[PDB]
A paper describes a structure:
YceI proteins are a family of bacterial lipocalins (BCNs), which are small proteins widely conserved in Gram-negative and Gram-positive bacteria but whose physiological role is unclear. In this study, we discovered that secreted BCNs contribute to antibiotic resistance by capturing and neutralizing antibiotics in the bacterial milieu. Visual inspection and structural alignments by the DALI server confirmed a barrel-shaped lipocalin fold for both proteins. An octaprenyl pyrophosphate was bound within a long, hydrophobic tunnel extending from one end of the barrel in each structure.
To elucidate the mode of binding of antibiotics within BCNs, we first solved the X-ray crystal structures of BcnA and BcnB to 1.4- and 1.6-Å resolutions, respectively. Analysis with the PDBePISA server predicted that BcnA is a monomer, while BcnB is a dimer, by crystallographic symmetry (~2,840 Å2 of buried surface area including a portion of the tunnel opening). These oligomeric states were confirmed in solution by size exclusion chromatography-multiangle light scattering (SEC-MALS). Superposition of BcnA chain A and BcnB chain C (148 Cα atoms, 22% sequence identity) resulted in a root mean square deviation (RMSD) of 1.66 Å. The largest structural differences observed were located in two of the loops that make up the tunnel opening. These differences may play a role in the antibiotic binding potential of BcnA and BcnB. Notably, the binding of BcnB to Nile red occurred with ~20-fold lower affinity than that of BcnA, agreeing with the lesser role of BcnB in antibiotic resistance. The secretion of the BcnA and BcnB proteins was also investigated by using FLAG-tagged derivatives; only BcnA was secreted extracellularly into the growth medium. The ΔbcnA mutant, but not the ΔbcnB mutant, had increased susceptibility (4-fold MIC reduction) to rifampin, norfloxacin, ceftazidime, and the cationic antimicrobial peptide polymyxin B (PmB) and a 2-fold meropenem MIC reduction.
Author numbering:
A (entry chain B): 6 to 174
B (entry chain A): 7 to 174
């Protein structure tokens, strides 16, 4: 069993969201995350606790970024952070998913992240073990009270593409 | 027909390796512009697009600035990347763009696969808008961008392209 702290400079949730009913895909990410992983490879368990600052969104449009902070969408004044906690599941000898709960826009809903890749190595600078993952999830944003655009043909399905690296304490 | 890219819905996003599979860097370039031609009867069309290197966003300001330097893109020398290509149709629908990318002053062949294509009247502008999601992949060392190669970094770089163009 081991405890690791996410390296913010290599931990980001990226997303994909719909524009105009399939016209194109909005892609972007949140720049500021932090948290902790625990992993016990021999017991085939582990956990994640991660927090993302909503104000750190980047869409490519500074105007959209600022607009999404308002009460029409994230209401970042009331809910500055999103938080995910979950239990790591293994399939064979490697982690394969995290089953847990996301709190976004003040609302808590189930969310499972599938782990597409997992690697551990000695960190080229800090020396201690660093574990890294690529993971994916999807949710319907209206389940978190985020239904803007629904009345105009926008699809609520939101994809998450997660980069994370965590360094053993 | 001729269409101008709407910069606010046109972005090349990317995926790149970190430490030989440790994780995936994701980001995008925020500023692009250009033009599409489409003759859907004749089943042909073209793309001409330019992206500003200084518009890169990776989530890490330190990395964004390091990428500008002569160690990587050398934006003082080469501020823009430019892609031109010919649209191919798989019948009625565009399916790919076959062309050339100029990146870091080097021109190489690059094919973009079109995963989705839709045209519709634009809500606000009241002219036709066409939109695509497209993908491509290249090896960055083919453009002289080999940083990290000595240290196990993979050179395969994926492009995930969002584009919307409004009919003139
Ligand atoms: C071993 C190890 C490393 C283990 C770890 C394992 C692991 C999997 C760890 C998890 C790590 C991490 C980082 C997890 C992240 C978890 C978190 C907190 C996730 C939540 C992320 C989050 C905040 C998601 C929100 C996503 C959303 C809803 C984004 C916004 C999408 C968006 C752009 C919607 C469109 C809105 C609008 C208004 C569009 C219209 O455009 P507009 O320009 O106005 O004009 P037009 O009129 O043309 O439409
Ligand atoms: C009808 C219609 C709409 C038709 C249109 C069809 C169509 C397909 C149109 C195309 C539209 C568009 C927008 C096309 C775009 C084409 C263009 C010009 C594409 C080029 C984009 C471009 C500039 C690509 C470059 C991508 C690259 C190489 C990005 C950087 C990758 C990167 C971050 C690599 C990592 C490098 C390093 C050094 C990482 C290590 O640093 P770090 O992790 O901080 O370090 P350490 O751990 O030590 O701290």
């Amino acid at each position: 069993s081991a405890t690791y702290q996410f390296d913010p400079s290599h931990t980001y949730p990226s997303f994909e969201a719909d524009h105009f009913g399939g016209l194109s895909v909005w892609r972007g990410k949140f720049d500021k995350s932090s948290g902790t992983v625990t992993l016990d490879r021999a017991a085939k368990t582990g956990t994640v606790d991660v927090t993302t600052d909503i104000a750190s969104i980047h869409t490519g449009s500074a105007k959209l970024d600022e607009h999404l902070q308002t009460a029409e969408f994230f209401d970042a004044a009331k809910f500055p952070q999103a938080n995910y906690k979950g239990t790591i599941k293994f399939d064979g000898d490697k982690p394969v998913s995290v089953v847990g709960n996301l709190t976004l826009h003040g609302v808590t809903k189930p969310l499972t992240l599938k782990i597409d890749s997992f690697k551990c190595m000695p960190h080229p600078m800090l020396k201690r073990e660093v574990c890294g993952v690529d993971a994916v999830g999807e949710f319907s944003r209206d389940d978190f009270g985020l239904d803007y655009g629904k009345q105009y043909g926008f699809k609520m399905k939101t994809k998450l593409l997660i980069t994370a690296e965590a360094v053993k304490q």
